Enzyme design. Structure first.
Site, PDB file in Angstrom:
ATOM      1  N   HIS A 133      -3.249   7.631   2.722  1.00 40.79           N
ATOM      2  CA  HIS A 133      -3.021   6.517   3.662  1.00 40.79           C
ATOM      3  C   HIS A 133      -3.419   5.166   3.084  1.00 40.79           C
ATOM      4  O   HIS A 133      -4.329   5.090   2.260  1.00 40.79           O
ATOM      5  CB  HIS A 133      -3.856   6.725   4.922  1.00 40.79           C
ATOM      6  CG  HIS A 133      -5.328   6.669   4.670  1.00 40.79           C
ATOM      7  ND1 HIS A 133      -6.022   7.716   4.104  1.00 40.79           N
ATOM      8  CD2 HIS A 133      -6.235   5.688   4.885  1.00 40.79           C
ATOM      9  CE1 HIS A 133      -7.298   7.393   4.006  1.00 40.79           C
ATOM     10  NE2 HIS A 133      -7.453   6.165   4.465  1.00 40.79           N
ATOM     11  N   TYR A 171      -4.247  -5.175  -2.521  1.00 43.72           N
ATOM     12  CA  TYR A 171      -3.807  -3.809  -2.743  1.00 43.72           C
ATOM     13  C   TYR A 171      -4.239  -3.309  -4.135  1.00 43.72           C
ATOM     14  O   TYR A 171      -4.807  -2.224  -4.265  1.00 43.72           O
ATOM     15  CB  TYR A 171      -2.287  -3.735  -2.565  1.00 43.72           C
ATOM     16  CG  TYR A 171      -1.656  -2.388  -2.867  1.00 43.72           C
ATOM     17  CD1 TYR A 171      -1.472  -1.438  -1.864  1.00 43.72           C
ATOM     18  CD2 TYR A 171      -1.209  -2.083  -4.140  1.00 43.72           C
ATOM     19  CE1 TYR A 171      -0.885  -0.219  -2.134  1.00 43.72           C
ATOM     20  CE2 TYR A 171      -0.620  -0.865  -4.419  1.00 43.72           C
ATOM     21  CZ  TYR A 171      -0.462   0.061  -3.411  1.00 43.72           C
ATOM     22  OH  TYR A 171       0.118   1.270  -3.680  1.00 43.72           O
ATOM     23  N   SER A 230      -1.229   3.932  -7.685  1.00 44.77           N
ATOM     24  CA  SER A 230      -0.016   3.171  -7.930  1.00 44.77           C
ATOM     25  C   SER A 230      -0.066   2.466  -9.274  1.00 44.77           C
ATOM     26  O   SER A 230      -1.135   2.338  -9.869  1.00 44.77           O
ATOM     27  CB  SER A 230       0.149   2.135  -6.820  1.00 44.77           C
ATOM     28  OG  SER A 230      -0.406   2.617  -5.604  1.00 44.77           O
ATOM     29  N   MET A 234      -8.498   4.874   9.953  1.00 42.58           N
ATOM     30  CA  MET A 234      -9.495   5.030   8.903  1.00 42.58           C
ATOM     31  C   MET A 234     -10.257   3.723   8.670  1.00 42.58           C
ATOM     32  O   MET A 234     -11.130   3.662   7.807  1.00 42.58           O
ATOM     33  CB  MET A 234      -8.862   5.570   7.615  1.00 42.58           C
ATOM     34  CG  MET A 234      -8.147   6.910   7.804  1.00 42.58           C
ATOM     35  SD  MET A 234      -9.251   8.340   7.874  1.00 42.58           S
ATOM     36  CE  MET A 234      -8.140   9.578   8.566  1.00 42.58           C
TER      37      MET A 234
END
Ligand SMILES: NC(=O)c1ccc[n+]([C@@H]2O[C@H](COP(=O)([O-])OP(=O)(O)OC[C@H]3O[C@@H](n4cnc5c(N)ncnc54)[C@H](OP(=O)(O)O)[C@@H]3O)[C@@H](O)[C@H]2O)c1
Ligand SMILES: NC(=O)c1ccc[n+]([C@@H]2O[C@H](COP(=O)([O-])OP(=O)(O)OC[C@H]3O[C@@H](n4cnc5c(N)ncnc54)[C@H](OP(=O)(O)O)[C@@H]3O)[C@@H](O)[C@H]2O)c1
Ligand SMILES: C[C@@H]1CN(c2ccc(F)cc2C(F)(F)F)CCN1S(=O)(=O)c1ccc(C(N)=O)cc1Cl
Ligand SMILES: C[C@@H]1CN(c2ccc(F)cc2C(F)(F)F)CCN1S(=O)(=O)c1ccc(C(N)=O)cc1Cl
Lengths: 261, 260
Positions: A99, A162, A149, A72
């Protein structure tokens, strides 16, 4: 949201894509989806591990199971994977963005390259897939499902790149939900806020640095599927109880009323 | 606790300093007797600003023009600026890519440019400036928005990039506490402000009360002088009240010892 109790048959015959489905929560979702008789198309980079998953799915009773491999990082692949999956199933009801570029625990020093890659894979590509899928999702009044998350709701050290990408998902997809509200597009957006889940990639990256409990990946996966089936705005999952209750932000719910007009 | 003298002789960079809040911020800095280096794409306007900063009592004022879509310019712009001023005490990340009010309509290019300019260039600028700030125990100030805290329609790409800033810069803020890096980080969450560009964008679709950019600019500088983690600035005090997030403060405090 579907004021109703989850039934496994909600997912029967449903045409579903699951990304990053070669391991961890992606795999487990695919399996759950297979047991409920879904048509599943999965993607990831490793064709080898993907095929193995597709084997396990067909047995479990999947109305159909297929795989397509690619990265991706390549947005052209992102786009084509969704049209191709559409083909193999005859339409698309549920799109599951899951993903992530591979990450570990580091103090951020100079890796602007890891920051961009995280932004592209963890976020931008989600937008590409979403655009690819939206046509099919409007006809099926389907659902987008976006896995995020705790690091994408609150701030933690050693996961800078992240966290930015998860935060970015919140910002983009929540903003899009409201657009669908105004323009009356009937496609659900579910944001899933996961605490530590015991995937083999997480437990590898957490070993030594962080001591905390990992919730099962199996129930994690079912929980994500239910949140999307029932078209909820957000889903929270975390071994703790303290955690899941603070995530909701009513004051945020409050300000988002300023637009209402 | 704040007093203008705090920024006297302090060396400061302002990005997107040719217009709106950026220009206003440079001007406040100038009055306060700061060394200032400013940037934007247009040299014509940066020139006007630089002479004005001088009239306003600026210890020193210079522009460097270039586009933050270029991470090479961004990274050299900071080297050059710092060497000019003999160091750096404060970096004020403020610029954004041209944005308007529209429904997301498949325009992925705009979403990526926004991440590039609004979010990623802020990181490159920071990396470039970190050594000088460590040296001066200086500060990074990030200019964000209500859409960087809450979800609104018609600003998808923009909100994404501003949310990105919060998640990235709050994360690194935790990191500095613990690695004992003495460089403050301030996120400024601004509601609507009466900048020519905000005002042209937000109309005649709708409209709420626009706070004034001269006020806003100063509160941003103050927030930064005083090393506060977040600065809120809106027309409505009821709005400012609702921006803070105590649940988050607790989840971060709880998982603070979680551990090492
Ligand atoms: N598990 C946790 O502790 C935890 C905590 C918070 C949030 N989450 C969220 O849960 C989701 C899944 O986490 P996980 O731990 O199960 O993930 P994981 O085990 O690391 O795997 C995610 C999947 O993404 C695939 N992938 C990696 N790079 C890719 C690329 N460039 N293009 C396409 N696919 C790629 C991987 O397969 P390939 O290597 O074959 O490409 C892998 O199957 C993520 O969105 C994560 O942010 C998890
Ligand atoms: N004003 C508001 O209603 C409002 C509300 C919430 C948040 N904010 C935040 O406040 C900050 C300033 O907003 P503003 O309204 O004052 O903006 P603005 O006046 O319209 O312009 C910002 C600056 O960015 C520069 N710029 C544009 N593209 C650039 C590029 N590619 N590379 C480098 N610089 C570039 C512009 O100069 P050039 O065109 O010459 O390049 C300009 O000096 C932004 O971070 C914004 O997110 C503002
Ligand atoms: C460390 C974990 C797992 N991680 C993850 C997931 C998949 C991967 F493949 C790799 C990782 C990572 F650990 F390397 F970042 C993503 C970030 N998080 S989390 O958001 O689940 C989280 C949960 C609880 C706490 C807490 N202290 O209460 C803190 C955080 Cl950041
Ligand atoms: C519309 C303004 C100014 N804008 C901005 C700034 C500078 C620019 F150059 C361009 C813009 C934009 F509007 F075009 F995006 C950035 C986004 N916002 S905001 O976050 O301050 C905001 C304030 C109040 C409401 C509300 N209706 O309650 C919603 C939002 Cl999103």
């Amino acid at each position: 949201p579907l004021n109703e109790e989850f039934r496994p048959e909600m997912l029967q015959g449903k045409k579903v894509i699951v990304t990053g489905a070669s391991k961890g929560i992606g795999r487990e979702m695919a399996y759950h989806l297979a047991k409920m008789g879904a048509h599943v198309v999965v993607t990831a980079r490793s064709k080898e591990t993907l095929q193995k998953v597709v084997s396990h799915c067909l047995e479990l009773g999947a109305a159909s199971a297929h795989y397509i491999a690619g990265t991706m990082e390549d947005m052209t692949f992102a786009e084509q994977f969704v049209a191709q999956a559409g083909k193999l199933m005859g339409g698309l009801d549920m799109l599951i963005l899951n993903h992530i570029t591979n990450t570990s625990l580091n103090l951020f020093h100079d890796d602007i390259h890891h920051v961009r890659k995280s932004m592209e894979v963890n976020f931008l590509s989600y937008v590409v897939l979403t655009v690819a899928a939206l046509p099919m999702l409007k006809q099926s009044n389907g659902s987008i499902v976006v896995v995020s998350s705790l690091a994408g709701k609150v701030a933690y050290p050693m996961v800078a790149a992240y966290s930015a990408s998860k935060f970015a998902l919140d910002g983009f997809f929540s903003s899009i939900r409201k657009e669908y509200s105004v323009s009356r597009v009937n496609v659900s957006i579910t944001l899933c806020v996961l605490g530590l889940i015991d995937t083999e990639t997480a437990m590898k990256a957490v070993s030594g640095i962080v001591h905390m409990q990992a919730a099962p990946k199996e129930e994690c996966a079912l929980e994500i599927i239910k949140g999307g089936a029932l078209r909820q705005e957000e889903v929270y999952y975390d071994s703790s109880l303290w955690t899941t209750l603070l995530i909701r932000n009513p004051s945020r719910k409050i300000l988002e009323f300023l637009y209402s007009t």
